[PDB]
Amino acid sequence: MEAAHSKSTEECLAYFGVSETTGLTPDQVKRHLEKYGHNELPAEEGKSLWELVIEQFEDLLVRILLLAACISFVLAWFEEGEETITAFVEPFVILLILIANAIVGVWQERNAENAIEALKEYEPEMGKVYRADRKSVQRIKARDIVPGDIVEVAVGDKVPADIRILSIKSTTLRVDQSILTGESVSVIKHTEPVPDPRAVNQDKKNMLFSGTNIAAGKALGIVATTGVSTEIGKIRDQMAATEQDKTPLQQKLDEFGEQLSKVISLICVAVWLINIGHWIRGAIYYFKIAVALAVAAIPEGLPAVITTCLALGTRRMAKKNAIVRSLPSVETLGCTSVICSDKTGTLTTNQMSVCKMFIIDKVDGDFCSLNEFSITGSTYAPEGEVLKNDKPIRSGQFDGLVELATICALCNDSSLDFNETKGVYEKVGEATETALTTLVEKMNVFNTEVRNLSKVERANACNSVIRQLMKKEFTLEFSRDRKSMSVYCSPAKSSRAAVGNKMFVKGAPEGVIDRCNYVRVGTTRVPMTGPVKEKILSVIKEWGTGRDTLRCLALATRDTPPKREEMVLDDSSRFMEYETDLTFVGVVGMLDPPRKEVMGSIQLCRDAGIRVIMITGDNKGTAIAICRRIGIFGENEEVADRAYTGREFDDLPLAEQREACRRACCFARVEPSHKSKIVEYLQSYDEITAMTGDGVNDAPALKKAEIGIAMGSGTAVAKTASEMVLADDNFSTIVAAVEEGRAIYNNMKQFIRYLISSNVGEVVCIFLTAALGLPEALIPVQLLWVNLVTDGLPATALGFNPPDLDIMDRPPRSPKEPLISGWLFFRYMAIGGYVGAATVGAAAWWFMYAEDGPGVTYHQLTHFMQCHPHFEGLDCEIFEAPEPMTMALSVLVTIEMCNALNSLSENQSLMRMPPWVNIWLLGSICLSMSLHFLILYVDPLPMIFKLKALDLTQWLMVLKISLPVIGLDEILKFIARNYLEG
């Protein structure tokens, strides 16, 4: 039954054809099951391990790096293998790296908890239905509840289906709908049809939504929808539907990878360009250079280096209490352009606070004076002080304030509890009432010593003094008609009727103040006149529709109550006349106040070019008032077309909506799906958006946003949906979390540039040793070992570079900003040209012009393949020698050690930026050298690798070749800052 909130109770009973008095039939329930299925959100299952590993292989660079590992296996099989059988295992290192880099990724994806299973925790197991099967109530499996069933709910029950209320058997039925509206105050339901067929859950006061739970009362209803078709079912349907996008950086690495897949295909054509005429050996040569061509092109270990860089940011962030569940999100938080954030529980403490209160002062003539007070503290904890005119006063010095707190402590069902496990006070009962309980604690009316109390005894210390002052005989409950409630108290002394027993009354100000024939002035009573009533009804309207928009409760007493045996308590309708001839005492103003640090944190995002949008299910006038307090709006700023309710927003034509999401800062009366749209719209303008929330109703927006941030105090659902938890609930840690993102990516830019322009030299070299007939090509094992650990250690040290000073004064980077720019392309083309020649020039220097180099002949080194009169006097097996290739390896090692010293800063001299500033960089160069020394001096490693040679002079030669790269860059660096300024 769709739109059941708008039809009558008879109409709903008629829609299915049932009476309340007797349920559905076994005939009906069987047919309904076959029509509507069972009552359950369907579980969503993760990917199988087979289908998870396969996803690692979809990337092209690993799809071609896999292809090169296979090609190596064949070459390993052939007699070059069998000449040196032990050292054919270079593919296994390739394969092992592909297996490792894939295994860390699957563990990244395998370790993950399900936010839909977290939602199904709101499905109750059992349900109470009346069916025609039997006369009594029937407790059955809630998944067997079909629509049209008659169901019953009492205190503490989870509502098992979306239910239209038929009969509220208690006085009020109070429901906790935080799962849909994000609010915590109990909603008072009714049975009258709500007509608008496009009313939001906040307006559907006659509905009971599956997942929500009953706070107080008992009710009977008829099921409107079961299973996925329910408001909570729409939440997960939009949660399973959303699909998280590719990181902007991972887009570039896919962009970059997609181009190597093409430029690798092209260099293989230029090798075949050797057709200038002006079989196993020929085959092996085409392949043995193709494999090394791929190994020299794709930056292996860059996935390894990137992973450990984020993993350390995860570790440093946890020091600042930001728990990062997804490692790729530590950089996307830097380019956050917009921050969408929930209100209650996020920007505010979600703890009702009594900010202001007043009582009468003077009443003479048409003049009426009020004592107005201010109460500090933004939490249920009894911490905070009462102020009059911003100077602290002692509440118990005002006789009117004594009565005000007595009414607050006695006309109250709520309590205060200190959770020793959590270390924080928690409400016991209604949020609205618990606020009054905390007020009495802050305003220690009878001056009870509370400094030495344990934290558990402090919770109710002051209320318990008042409880022992007067005995609470009975309580006239809250009822919808009068919007008021009362308690009947007897003095519990020997004075009895002389000191007199009293009625204490609290409720909506209009209803109470009408039934107030007197006005309390301290101890004395004065008749309620026109002027006095207006003066108090004036201030209430000011506190109601002001810059402080506060729910006001009127506190009155009845000094001469009716006779205890004269009042009947079966009937909630006589209660209003019972609460008559009252004496007005005072008024209190309530607010879920913003967290201490939220305001300043917003100003910091504004300073960093990040806007903040509030999106709340709370009433609009309240969200606007919290917005002014936070700084989203000005204190006197006339919000006009800048704050919309979900309905007003939905009423705009689709075109105007996207423009609204760019100019509007506040959104209220919002259903869960409304938040996901606004995120989606902001994303349509291609700015990275961040969603902060804590409730279940935020899980759609938390998933859609590129970066979800859940509060620690929030629901599990919200955490499971998001990529970051604020352990300490400190909103300031978001601003700090961004700073890390901006800083990391800057360092990521360096070690990506550093590791890539290292890869570009390995292709210039491998091409030179292939275009010209040079024997000495770098062996793939060297490129691997260097690109993995010899280049890995330095690149990771670029991750520790100092951050920029203005890092938080620049606007967010464009997500499509390219890493290698225009000149920086040339700068690395020139750097790539050098290191490409420096490794191949060493190769020739051994044979041609060296004392231990027997070859010489240069022109014959270029044509050494055939190997007799042209090769006479020289051994052919001397070209396989390991000594001529150490220079190539040691050139590349020393130049990339030096190129890493150029990577500590783009476009800036190291004469001006000494490597001292990054001490980590220098130590990492040492270990790559110390490990390089190891790969040259221990038989198991110089057998796979090359042998040390010309130690006295070769080392000088490599150091003599590697120096000009610092000058090449330092000249290119000076060319850069001379031209960038103009």
Ligand SMILES: C/C=C(/C)C(=O)O[C@H]1C(C)=C2[C@H]([C@@H]1OC(=O)CCCCCCC)[C@@](C)(OC(C)=O)C[C@H](OC(=O)CCC)[C@@]1(O)[C@H]2OC(=O)[C@@]1(C)O
């Ligand atoms: C030689 C080794 C590599 C890995 C290579 O070819 O990378 C190219 C390449 C794919 C790009 C280029 C490289 O371009 C060249 O190398 C041009 C000359 C090639 C001839 C050499 C043979 C004689 C990078 C290396 O810039 C330079 C320094 O030339 C990175 C850059 O931006 C990045 O991808 C950096 C972020 C990872 C990309 O041009 C990139 O392609 C893109 O899609 C871009 C736009 O992104």
Ligand SMILES: Nc1ncnc2c1ncn2[C@@H]1O[C@H](COP(=O)(O)OP(=O)(O)OP(=O)(O)O)[C@H]2OC3(O[C@H]21)C([N+](=O)[O-])=CC(=[N+]([O-])O)C=C3[N+](=O)[O-]
């Ligand atoms: N934003 C808020 N700030 C402060 N309080 C809020 C706020 N929102 C709701 N409440 C309190 O919560 C109860 C929720 O009832 P509900 O039907 O949702 O009423 P609304 O006034 O909110 O109409 P609305 O949905 O906004 O159009 C109300 O009952 C009472 O105080 C109200 C109430 N009253 O409204 O008059 C009287 C009362 N006693 O005891 O007299 C107890 C309440 N209570 O415990 O929640």
Ligand SMILES: [Cl-]
């Ligand atoms: Cl509203």
Ligand SMILES: [K+]
């Ligand atoms: K997300």
Ligand SMILES: [Mg+2]
């Ligand atoms: Mg919330």
Ligand SMILES: [Mg+2]
């Ligand atoms: Mg309201």
